Symmetry: C4
């Protein structure tokens, strides 16, 4: 109801200067105060109780580092290559449907500008349901070396997909991410709630359709949305290039595991089934700090993705916001490796980690209301009255 004015006093001239944004949560606190209710509902939502959405972040907290001291770390190099090309930093913007709800004027173009306008050029997955055409987004994209991938929601009308694959290969996208964790649109009750005052995606998809989609294209194929060791090993038996261990930001099945627990489980199997070199394994979901990024790289992930932080940077400070988020994260990784005693993404191995309490995901017995309610704790000292 006419909040738009209050909200406008918020973003107009009260957002702080980008030089004061310390971490990816600041982009998120500011976007929750100014985005429109339906932008906010749609970007932040999770499926149902959002325990997977949050467990995704929190599972990073079950893993602690075992650093090395007295290692020369004057120079640290954080570039890696993902899926053939060499990339500046080991993370990427992952794909967000409808980026124009938050940044109406420039949509997923400003993200494209942000991933290539600064020193660091980060990859950008363009969403099949992006609110700006592939055409435009790739054209906004400031800088040759900055790479871009299409993620695909195969349609029931396979005609539309085949044309679309062909048209983006024409446009030079550098790989195909087929999202398979969404045969139906998980329930996101925050949306639902405010929406009170699908043909588009084919629920029939199958590994055979991935096999045929292989033959219809030359780009590399990454299945986005694996959540089991068994389908990582399958995506390897039908020969795709990649697999993103992901549960769609916890917007699809609640009580799906966090990707980092599934990565730590799958990688030893890959190594024992000898498949490890044959598969790029990416991981996204709830990654908010450089040490999160680094924990996933140490276990074997090739690149970790981020959806919501970029998206809220982009919605509050447009393409410049996305540049600042790209470097905030770039400095976190870089400072932490220096502190970890490694100098290059390939040095990042598992023995930099204490994985002994990775499975200490607990649900504690219900608090004792009454005992807690009569108990009074000690008190600090006081200060003279006056």
């Amino acid at each position: 109801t006419k909040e738009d004015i209050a909200r406008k006093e918020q973003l107009k001239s009260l957002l702080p200067p980008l030089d004061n944004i310390i971490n990816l949560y600041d982009f998120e606190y500011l976007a929750s105060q100014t985005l429109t209710k339906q932008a906010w509902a749609y970007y932040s939502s999770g499926a149902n109780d959002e325990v997977t959405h949050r467990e995704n972040h929190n599972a990073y907290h079950r893993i602690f580092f075992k650093p090395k001291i007295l290692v020369d770390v004057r120079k640290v190099d954080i570039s890696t290559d993902m899926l053939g090309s060499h990339v500046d930093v080991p993370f990427y913007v992952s794909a967000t449907a409808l980026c124009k709800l938050g940044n109406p004027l420039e949509g997923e173009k400003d993200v494209a500008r942000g991933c290539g306008q600064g020193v660091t050029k980060v990859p950008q997955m363009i969403s099949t349901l992006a609110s700006c055409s592939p055409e435009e987004i790739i054209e906004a994209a400031p800088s040759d070396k900055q790479i871009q991938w299409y993620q695909l929601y195969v349609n029931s009308d396979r005609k539309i997909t085949d044309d679309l694959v062909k048209n983006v290969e024409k446009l030079g996208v550098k790989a195909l991410f087929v999202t398979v964790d969404a045969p139906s649109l998980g329930q996101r009750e925050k949306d639902m709630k405010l929406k009170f005052s699908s043909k588009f995606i084919d629920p029939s998809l199958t590994w055979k359709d991935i096999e045929e989609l292989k033959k219809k294209t030359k780009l590399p194929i990454v299945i986005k949305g694996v959540q089991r060791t068994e389908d990582v090993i399958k995506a390897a038996e039908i020969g795709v290039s990649g697999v993103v261990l992901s549960n769609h930001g916890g917007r699809q099945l609640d009580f799906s595991r966090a990707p980092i627990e599934v990565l730590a489980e799958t990688m030893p199997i890959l190594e024992q089934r000898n498949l490890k070199d044959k598969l790029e394994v990416f991981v996204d979901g709830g990654v908010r700090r450089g040490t999160d990024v680094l924990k996933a790289l140490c276990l074997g992930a090739k690149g970790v993705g981020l959806g919501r932080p970029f998206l809220y940077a982009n919605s509050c400070y447009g393409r410049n916001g996305v540049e600042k988020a790209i470097e905030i994260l770039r400095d976190e990784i870089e400072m932490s490796m220096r502190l970890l005693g490694v100098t290059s993404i390939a040095e990042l191995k598992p023995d930099l980690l204490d994985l002994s309490t990775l499975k200490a995901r607990t649900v504690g017995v219900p608090n004792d209301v009454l005992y807690n309610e009569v108990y009074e704790g000690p008190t600090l000292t006081e200060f003279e009255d006056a």
Copy 2:
């Protein structure tokens, strides 16, 4: 003919004379065995209690429980005016109207309810204090009632991708019939507290009127008679199940089984987990400023259930089993099923959550080959479609809900019970696709991550001095705000 004078006189505990609907009853022998505590009858002895009485009981109870020669006689004209008891609402102020504006249509239109918690919220705001305490309470500290639900959250899923999940089919077979859904309505006592006009006649209706029909379990302590509730059923194809408390006068029980069998209920669920009434302190508290009885016999034994099979042709399900050895025993006397339950945490506190006993029991049932010969149901704390799926993956034939159907029926009558069925039917169908399975038959434990099932912790007390002085990081302030 009995004079008011003579009547009123006997207002004392070892001589309870009371009047209900212009009739005097000698309730002396009766009150220590009144299911809803003897306090009510004791206190209101020597009065005309009909307003307490008439709106909370099944129409058949005076005839069914009191010896014929205790129905004393007609009261002459009427009581003294301050001897007719007004409707029982302990602790309720004149609130009755503020909670009636609260419910009168400020209750949101029934197509805006997104989940089963919405009905809890709505009922906690509009229901009568006696009925909220009665419906929402657990035994003592309620740690088993909360634990019943949180134990679900110690289980994660292990989904399949790129499976054609175009058509998914959630229907199944429970106890001989084929049901549309894998959940049912468990027996709750006294539904008229929250739905004074229809009570159970409305859950008979929401369960059967729609394109999905859910099994209904009727309670031995239901505020409507089993005839009234079956007669309310709108569909000829919906299943009703009768739940039994066996009385110390076993002929009373024996007539009751014969009766519900003729009305055509389809199974007999014999509750065995309340030999004594658990202590529900929110209720208790509500009378102080507002445990045995012969009614539930505290002597049932495995031999009784052995004798009941012989008296009946309905399948018998033992409802209230809390450990594997009793699951295995129930199997050995050839009963058809067992409902793993702790009665919604209203009886022993620190009884375990049924999802955890089921994860324990079903592998022992498989290894003993008794697995295919006993259907195992589970209830307690099931609020979402993925709780139901966690139980079906571990082996339970069917999942019971007692409390969400009581708040739904309480705020919205039968269309609440039908809406509540759609919420949950959609949530299950919806996560069967995202799990990559298309039929209940495909739910297997290899779809669950069971490795932290047992990670039920009690953490050490924390340090109020360390945390009293710690300040966390802060977010950026706006230039304004």
Copy 3:
């Protein structure tokens, strides 16, 4: 400061009628509002951070029951015998120094009246630093069969102790509890704090002094204050009768284990070293409900003790308070056995218990301030405005 008047409007005629006290916590909420600050400080205190004081209660919550259904439980008998005599119920009032701070007019006499004035007669441990003489307390004691024990703080001046042992044996006390967990008076900073506006106990005590104290008396001897399996087995090698597994209500060493964890550990060793029949093992600390009592009895304890609940019942409703607390607890035990499917304290064995998470005493990693601070949960439905 003149709170005494407000406080007096509290206890005078605003305490609820004893018939409305539902559980042992109600006695505690009411005593915290009316006791004098120094009574309250001294009764509720723990050593230092009070984590042992609370862990004592909470460790009961790590243990869940495995009940039996379809057991005739029309009749349940909860009496047991402790230390030779046969006792009504399996719990006892444990010893509280200075009971007159809360009940100034009748001190530990009203407790003595309370343990024998009703149907149930419960034991009463009389404290060496009780604020009423043994003489009086035993004389207040209404009823022959009601039993009473002295607990002893041996003095440095052993003369005073020897006379005192002899004088209480004269007075018919039924056993000696020597408290050994207190060679110094643990720091109870709530006291300390309000006290801003020892020869009495011998820190030299040793198992030899217990050996000699055996020869100077005929009463049975219980060492109160064992906290290790090793000294349970020692108290058995020098032949005393009992041992109370206790850490003095967590007023002595913080980070002492809860008695119930130590009981569950010690009892199998006793059984394997064959000593089990030779030792009564009691257990007190943080027992507040009948199911607590029952969990300790199932593992082998002979009787569980309670300090603070009796003490606050006694300070708010004097001897009648203590009667009501004795029956509140008596009905809890009795209802729960009925629900457990057992009919007699000897039926209470370990297999009535799920001890699988007894050691799930966890300290979780620090909450993530910022993530939690930007996250907003789902919302219940609302109700029309008006």
Copy 4:
């Protein structure tokens, strides 16, 4: 002679000219290597900065760090009035006086402080915002800083009874000397933020004036010179230890070791866990509206420590080891000790708590026989006497505290540092009796319950809808109140 005009001119990042105490300095080469960030120097370039400068630095720093020919010359008379910088208190309003009434004597009399948390509380109320942020902050999310202390609580005790604990003796030997206590004061940088007049000269004093004297570790970044701090020591028998950051200009480091060795410090603690400055976001935040440098060389290697042994006769302790393999390496190059530390959680977040690495390390040190040849110290989050005892039982020779001595010295100067020593000396003595041991030598791991050491959990998110609607039990209301 230099004219104000010429000076002020160069107020730009690649030409920093600044005036401090009537003297112009060319600080251009210098500011990217200024330990307290280059931002301060950058911003105040072209001004007379003496009020920022004079009150926060050791008296010897311009002479020790700047090339002699950069000390430009005398400034002629004085700056423009709005070019003399006022004392740095970022984000502090005129608050300086409300916090000065706060501290002026409404600070409670020093014999009422019951524990080390009291000083935290008092300093958080009276200290300057720059100094509270600086002293109290951790890296990033601060989970290692809090975790440093809570890890203690995952260890319980296993006490002895009926042991004669009449006389208990807490004294011990650390690094060759015999100390009265098993704790010491770890090096904190900039003590003048919280104690502007004496800084470190007062912890030299509280540590030595009393009947108990505690070892003091002096920082390479101390706001007083190592001479001033040793000269302040009141007792001839107290131990001072020097902590080193080695600089990229190794001659600067080499002169510094030679110097502190002549002043008679007793050990060299070489911090190795901050090659780069951890990101302490409370500080950061305080300048926005208020990481390498050559100063700490990011190239030290095990060979450097190998070369330092040859240059020195002090024992060398490596301070900042976070894993067993580096404990074992430090042992293999024959250094005397290792301080298991993560620098008070100010450097890498998700580094482990030192009490847990020590429980891991000491059994591997015993089995390799290196156990007796390396003294292992531990710091981080030690606030009570039973934390110290948990570390001594597991093997640590001595426990370090950096932050409680900084709040104590900040609110109460040297008598705070002496009081803080008594609080902790009493708490240790006191629990050695209740453990039943009378000497540090008797503390062994068979006195600890170590079975839940590793029970460091992160629980699943909980269900805000289930808990939003649950109401717990309530206590009895008074008839009144």
